[PDB]
C-alpha cells in the first residue's frame, strides 16, 4: 500500500501556526494563519534549496487569527480573530474590502457557503451567526444553540441538501437547515469537549473529535451513527482526502491516516528527536491541508513551522 | 477600598472640666444592589462557580427534531 515521505519545511513565522488554506485555481500558492497576528501568503517552488518563500503578509487583526478560508475563484480570503472581528481580504492588493462586526467576545471558526454568496461563524459568545457578503448580519440562533463555546461550524459541499454542521464544548454535534434557520438533529456520544468537525467531498459523512482521543463517524442524510476509531491521546484537526476513501487526523505530536475500506491505519507520521528535559518533548501538530492534487500534505506546528509530506510507492 | 467600605465621623462634647473628643468608624457590608452598602467587591475576594448536573456514562445515540 502507499506510504508518506518528508519533502521540506517553511520558516517565516513568529507564533504557533493556527490554520492552512488552499485552492485548485493556483497550485503554486498556499495561505496560513498564526498567533503572531498575521496571515502569510507563500510562493511555493520546486527548487532544491528550500520549498517556498513568504510572498506577502496581511496585518490588520489586533490579536491571534483563529481560522482562514479562500473563495472558489482564488481572488479573495476570509478570516476570524480573538479580537472578535471578521474580515474579507483582496489577495491581489493585500487589503480588506469589508469588515464584519456584531460578536461581543472572541471568534473560533468561519466558513463560506458552497456558492460563495453567504458567510457563517462561531464563537466563545455561544451564538452561531449568518452574514451577507455586503457585511450585514441576517440571523442569530440564540436559545437553541450550544450551552458552552461553539468550537466549529461547516457547510455541506453538495447543493441538493443545504445544511450546516457544528460541534461545541457542551460535547454535542448538531445539524441545522439553512433556509428554515432551525436545528434538525442532535448527536450524543463523546465524553470530552470537541475541537473539530469535517464532511466528505461527496456530501455523505461527518467526522468529529477532541480531548477523548476518539474519531466518530455520522451520517448527514440518513441521520444515524457509524463506527468509532480510537485515535490516541487527543484530536486537534481532521480531514478527508479529495480522491481516496481516507480519513486523516492530527493527534498530539503525530499525524495519522485510516483506510476506511476495512478500517485500518495506513501509516503514522513522526518527528526526529530533539532531547528535552521535560514532558511533551516534541512540538504538537495543530492543522492539516491536502493539496488540490491529493498527492501532497501540508501540516502546521507549535514550533512555528509548516512541514510538507509526499505520497510514495 | 477605604474610600467606599468605611464610614467615619468625629465630634466634640463640652463638660464642666473641658472638651472630650469622640471618633466613630463603621465597616459596611457588600450589597450587590439595595443601597445598604457598596456594589463593588473587595479586591482580593475571588469566588468560584460550582459545577452541576453532569452524567459520567455515555453511549452513542442520535435525536431528530
From Swiss-Prot, chain A:
It is a peripheral membrane protein. PROSITE patterns: WD_REPEATS_1, WD_REPEATS_2, WD_REPEATS_REGION. It comes from the Eukaryota. The modification Phosphothreonine is found at residues 5, 9, 95, 276. The modification Phosphotyrosine is found at residues 51, 227. InterPro entries: G-protein_beta_WD-40_rep, RACK1-like, WD40/YVTN_repeat-like_dom_sf, WD40_repeat_CS, WD40_repeat_dom_sf, WD40_rpt. Disulfide bonds: none annotated. GO terms for biological process: apoptotic process; gastrulation; rhythmic process. Signal peptide: none annotated. GO terms for molecular function: ribosome binding; translation regulator activity. WD repeats lie at residues 12-43, 60-90, 102-132, 145-177, 189-219, 230-259, 280-310. The keyword Repeat applies. One of its GO terms (cellular component) is phagocytic cup. Scaffolding protein involved in the recruitment, assembly and/or regulation of a variety of signaling molecules. Interacts with a wide variety of proteins and plays a role in many cellular processes. Component of the 40S ribosomal subunit involved in translational repression. Involved in the initiation of the ribosome quality control (RQC), a pathway that takes place when a ribosome has stalled during translation, by promoting ubiquitination of a subset of 40S ribosomal subunits. Binds to and stabilizes activated protein kinase C (PKC), increasing PKC-mediated phosphorylation. Monomer; also forms homodimers and homooligomers. Interacts with CPNE3. May interact with ABCB4. Component of the small (40S) ribosomal subunit. Interacts with the 80S ribosome. Binds NHERF1. Forms a ternary complex with TRIM63 and PRKCE. Interacts with HABP4, KRT1 and OTUB1. Interacts with SRC (via SH2 domain); the interaction is enhanced by tyrosine phosphorylation of RACK1. Recruited in a circadian manner into a nuclear complex which also includes BMAL1 and PRKCA. Interacts with AR. Interacts with IGF1R but not with INSR. Interacts with ADAM12. The 7 WD repeats mediate protein-protein interactions with binding partners. Belongs to the WD repeat G protein beta family. Ribosomal protein RACK1 subfamily. This is Small ribosomal subunit protein RACK1. The lineage of its organism: Eukaryota, Metazoa, Chordata, Craniata, Vertebrata.
UniProtKB/Swiss-Prot annotation, chain B:
GO terms for molecular function: class I DNA-(apurinic or apyrimidinic site) endonuclease activity; DNA binding; RNA binding; structural constituent of ribosome. Belongs to the universal ribosomal protein uS3 family. The chain holds residues 163 to 227 of 243 of the full protein. Methylation by PRMT1 is required for import into the nucleolus and for ribosome assembly. Sumoylation by SUMO1 enhances protein stability through increased resistance to proteolysis. Component of the 40S small ribosomal subunit. Identified in a IGF2BP1-dependent mRNP granule complex containing untranslated mRNAs. Interacts with HNRPD. Interacts with PRMT1; the interaction methylates RPS3. Interacts with SUMO1; the interaction sumoylates RPS3. Interacts with UBC9. Interacts with CDK1; the interaction phosphorylates RPS3. Interacts with PRKCD; the interaction phosphorylates RPS3. Interacts with PKB/AKT; the interaction phosphorylates RPS3. Residues 38-65 are annotated as: Disordered. Component of the small ribosomal subunit. The ribosome is a large ribonucleoprotein complex responsible for the synthesis of proteins in the cell. Has endonuclease activity and plays a role in repair of damaged DNA. Cleaves phosphodiester bonds of DNAs containing altered bases with broad specificity and cleaves supercoiled DNA more efficiently than relaxed DNA. Displays high binding affinity for 7,8-dihydro-8-oxoguanine (8-oxoG), a common DNA lesion caused by reactive oxygen species (ROS). Has also been shown to bind with similar affinity to intact and damaged DNA. The modification Phosphoserine is found at residues 47, 62. This is Small ribosomal subunit protein uS3.
